[PDB]
């Protein structure tokens, strides 16, 4: 049985338009380990993204953290895009300041 | 003392087909990564200046070679026995091994393995114990591995003799990072409505280190038992993020506060107050 990834997108600090911050995408609960994660700015892949090395929890499900420094604005949209063998096409979870 | 109390190594070995297999590995103090492993070269990556603990360059090189030979050897041996074990490709094997410092000072060692994301085996009292989920296959694996006294003895030494002194050495060598105190910041927000005539209030707590933290929704000095803690999420640079939520009826949100207690605050709790009608 393969397990699909859970994707959680959140900022390190409360969002304040024009102030330096970090966008995190925590991808967890998946199996097997092969996975593709990208952070997006207005649907375009962010090249300067850092990530953790593969780890797993007590139930053997894998998890990763992908993060990038960003400055939120009124109109710039951010998201996390993940592909895994359990998915037909990449799953996109948009960052939401109010959620 | 505060901070991590355990050290462990993890292995993820992915067998794509009969000719291709690759292993990923890493070294950790609880949730904090201190070693990387290059799958290609079969060499360790020391992520912190104190990652070698109190071990000499000689002993670190010896252990790297033990892991290099084991990682290459493990893929070689699984491929050779895959037919006998009725393995269908692709499959993935995971392993975790290490030791931990308990209250009272004892150091306990562990080793667990998985196949297909399910428990497969464990090591108790320096012996191979098949897990029920592993079935007949894990019973056959434990029979096979105990035929080779070389592997058993190397595992015993690493688990019960090498890991405990390594753990104490690296907890000491890394204390400036491991036992540091980083203050959290906290803020309030409004969550999606959980139901009719109900609001969800959210208390965000972020940037704290070490991991233990206390967050509660309050009415004065009274803890709200409805407080729901989300999962503790990682931040970059060894800090954490947590959301504490509370489902309330609109007319009952007034008078609520969120209280944060953390070792770095030295008794000065953070208190945020919910104020109504967008104030
Ligand atoms: C890396 O650090 C390890 C931990 O060191 C300690 O903690 C750190 C944080 C610092 O504060 C250090 O200054 C401090 O030493 C080192 O391992 C520890 O080494 C010491 C020896 O230096 C060793 O002590 C010996 O213990 C035995 C008894 O051990 C048995 O029983 C205990 C319970 O009582 C049990 O826990 C053990 O597992 C064993 O079953 C004792 O017989 C020795 O006594 C002799 O020596 C002392 C002087 O040292 C003397 O007064 C006595 O009269 C007698 O001659 C001695 O007390 C610790 O047990 C050991 N801790 C662990 C968990 O293994 C580590 O040292 C290296 O490995 C050791 C095993 C030993 O071979 C050392 O000589 C090595 O240098 C160090 N370096 C490395 C590379 O690992
Ligand atoms: C300072 C930074 C580091 C920190 C210190 C780390 C402390 C580590 C803590 C726990 C690790 C537990 C190790 C478990 C891996 C097995 C190692 C091994 O057997 O390896 C050998 C085994 O390698 C093989 O032969 C390949 C066979 C592997 C298949 C076996 C799979 C079984 C593994 C699970 C064990 C469960 C059974 C438990 C029963 C006790 C290879 O070693 P070698 O000595 O033979 O290589 C020689 C090298 N010196 C130069 O040539
Ligand atoms: C230095 C810095 C430190 C950096 C080092 C980081 C890298 C460390 C990676 C090594 C991690 C070790 C973790 C313990 C591994 C335990 C693995 C147990 O695996 C299983 O669960 C076994 C499942 C096998 C079923 C497949 C059937 C094939 C059987 C093959 C039998 C082989 C027989 C051998 C003879
Ligand atoms: C835990 O591991 C110990 C060390 O291997 C076991 O003791 C060993 O028992 C073997 C019997 O099959 C024997 O070859 C070893 O020489 C002896 N080791 C020692 C410490 O001298 C231990 O349990 C032992 O065996 C049982 C059957 C009884 O005779 C006990 O009195 C022994 O302690 C293992 N315990 C387990 C499996 O729960
Ligand atoms: C075996 O696996 C590798 C890794 O994905 C793949 O590139 C290769 O095509 C596979 N070999 C065959 C002949 O199927
Ligand atoms: Cl910042
Ligand atoms: Cl970045
Ligand atoms: Cl191979
Ligand atoms: Cl079988
Ligand atoms: Cl133990
Ligand atoms: Cl699998
Ligand atoms: Cl606030
Ligand atoms: Na920033
Ligand atoms: Na922006
Ligand atoms: Na938010």
Q: What angle do CA B145, A32, A23 make, to 5 degrees?
A: 130
Which stretches of chain B are DSSP H helices?
A: 57-81, 135-145, 149-157, 163-173, 175-178
| CA A63 to chain CA mean position, Å | 11
The CA distance from B163 to B167, in Å, is: 6
Distance in angstroms (rounded) separating the CA atoms of residues A99 and A17: 16
Q: A56, B185: Cβ pair inside 8 Å?
A: no
Is the distance from CB of B155 to CB of B123 less than 8 angstroms? yes
Task: Assign B44 to helix, strand or coil.
Answer: strand
φ/ψ of residue B52, rounded to 5: -85, 0
Q: Which of A53, A66, A68, A85 to mutate to test the interface with B (most CBs of B within 10 A)?
A: A53
What residues contact A58, with CB distance under 8 A and at least 6 apart? none
Are residues B191 and A12, on separate chains, in Cβ contact within 8 Å?
no
Q: Which among A8, A26, A31 has CB closest to B117?
A: A31
Closest CA to A85 of A29, A13, A32, A39: A32
Cβ contacts of residue B58 below 8 Å, gap of 6+?
A: none
* CB contacts < 8 A (A, B): 74
Distances (CA, A) of A87 to A3, A6, A91, B146: 10, 12, 7, 40
Instruction: Please answer whether residues B233 and B242 qualify as being in contact, where contact means their C-beta atoms are separated by less than 8 angstroms.
Output: yes
Give the burial string for B181-201 (b: 16+ CB within 10 Å, else e): ebbbebebbeeeeeeeeebbb
Give the residue from A88, A33, A8 showing the smallest Cα distance to B235: A8
Q: What are phi and psi of B155, to 5 degrees?
A: -60, -50
Q: What is the DSSP string of chain A?
A: --BPPEEEEEESS---TTS-EEEEEEEEEEBSS-EEEEEEETTEE-SS-EEPPPEE-TTS-EEEEEEEEE---SS--EEEEEEETT-SS-EEEE--TT-
Reduce the DSSP state of residue B108 to 3 states and report it: strand
Residue A55, Cβ neighbours under 10 Å: how many?
A: 20
How far is residue B9 from each of residues A39, B64, B102, B159, measured CA to CA in Å?
28, 12, 19, 11
Q: Report the distance separating Cα B173 and Cα B166, nearest Å.
A: 10
Q: How far apart are CA B5 and CA B29, in angstroms?
A: 7
Q: Name the phi and psi angles at A60, rounded to 5.
A: 75, 5
Who contacts B21 (Cβ-Cβ below 8 Å, separation ≥6)? B13, B14, B15, B75, B78, B79
Q: A59 and A13 in contact (C-beta within 8 Å)?
A: no
The protein residues having their C-beta less than 5 angstroms from ligand 7 (an ion) are A 48, 68-69
d(CA A39, CA A82) in angstroms, rounded, equals: 9
User: Looking at residue B88, what DSSP letter applies?
Assistant: P
d(CA B158, CA B54): 16
CA distances (Å), B196 to each of B70, B200, B229, B252, B276, in order?
A: 59, 11, 22, 14, 19
Q: Ligand 3, residues B25, B92, B127, B134: which to mutate, most atoms within 8 A of Cβ?
A: B25
Return d(Cα B28, Cα A8) in angstroms, integer: 23
Determine whether A88 is exposed, middle or buried from the number of CB atoms within 10 Å of its CB (0-12, 13-18, 19+).
Answer: exposed
Domains located in chain A, CATH noted: 1-99 (2.60.40.10)
Query: How many other CB atoms are found less than 10 A from the CB of residue B70?
Result: 19
The resolution, in Å, is: 1.7
Breaks (C-N over 2.5 A) in chain B follow: none
* Bridge partner residues of B101 (DSSP): B107
Residue B123 CA to residue B125 CA, distance in Å, equals 7
CB distance B204–A14 less than 8 Å?
yes
Ion ligand 14 — residues with CB under 5 Å?
A: A 73, 76
How many whole angstroms separate alpha carbon B113 and alpha carbon B83? 20
Gap between the Cα atoms of B248 and B233, Å rounded: 25
- Strands (E) across B159-210 are located at 185-191, 198-208
Burial of B121 by CB count in 10 Å (0-12 exposed, 13-18 middle, 19+ buried)? buried
User: Which of B178, B184, B256, B258 has the alpha carbon at shortest distance from B216?
Assistant: B258
What experimental approach yielded this model? X-ray
Domains in chain B with CATH codes: 4-179 (3.30.500.10), 180-279 (2.60.40.10)
């Amino acid at each position: 049985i393969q397990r699909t990834p859970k994707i959680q997108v959140y900022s390190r600090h409360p969002a304040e338009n024009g102030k330096s911050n970090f966008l995190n995408c925590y991808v967890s609960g998946f199996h097997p380990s092969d996975i593709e994660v990208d952070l997006l700015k207005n649907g375009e892949r962010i090249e300067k993204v850092e990530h953790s090395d593969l780890s797993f929890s007590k139930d053997w499900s894998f998890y990763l953290l992908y993060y990038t420094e960003f400055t939120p604005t009124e109109k710039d949209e951010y998201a996390c895009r993940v592909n895994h063998v359990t998915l037909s096409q990449p799953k996109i979870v948009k960052w939401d300041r109010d959620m | 003392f505060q901070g991590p109390t355990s050290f462990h190594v993890i292995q993820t070995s992915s067998f794509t087909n009969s000719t291709w297999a690759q292993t990923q590995g890493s070294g950790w103090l609880d949730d904090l990564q201190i070693h990387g492993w290059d799958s290609d070269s079969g060499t360790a990556i020391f992520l912190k200046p104190w990652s070698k603990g109190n071990f000499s360059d000689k002993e670190v090189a010896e252990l790297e070679e033990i892991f290099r030979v084991y990682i290459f050897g493990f893929a070689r041996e699984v491929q050779d026995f895959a037919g006998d074990f009725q393995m269908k490709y692709p499959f993935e094997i995971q392993g975790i091994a290490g030791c931990e410092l308990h209250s009272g000072g004892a150091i306990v060692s562990f080793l667990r393995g998985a196949l297909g994301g399910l428990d497969f085996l464990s090591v108790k009292n320096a012996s191979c114990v098949p897990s029920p989920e592993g079935g007949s296959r894990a019973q056959k694996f434990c029979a096979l591995i105990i035929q080779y006294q070389g592997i058993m003895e190397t595992v015993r030494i690493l688990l019960y003799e090498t890991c405990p002194r390594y753990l104490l050495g690296v907890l000491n060598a890394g204390k400036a990072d491991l036992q540091r105190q980083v203050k959290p910041e906290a803020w309030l927000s409004s969550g999606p409505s959980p139901g009719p005539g109900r609001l969800q209030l959210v208390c965000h707590v972020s940037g704290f280190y070490p991991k233990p933290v206390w967050v509660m929704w309050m009415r004065g000095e009274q803890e709200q038992q409805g407080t729901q803690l989300g999962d503790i999420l990682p931040n970059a640079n060894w800090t954490w993020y947590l959301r504490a939520t509370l489902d309330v009826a609109d007319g009952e949100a007034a008078g609520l506060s969120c209280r944060v207690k953390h070792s770095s605050l030295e008794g000065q709790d953070i208190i945020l107050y919910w104020r109504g009608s967008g104030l």
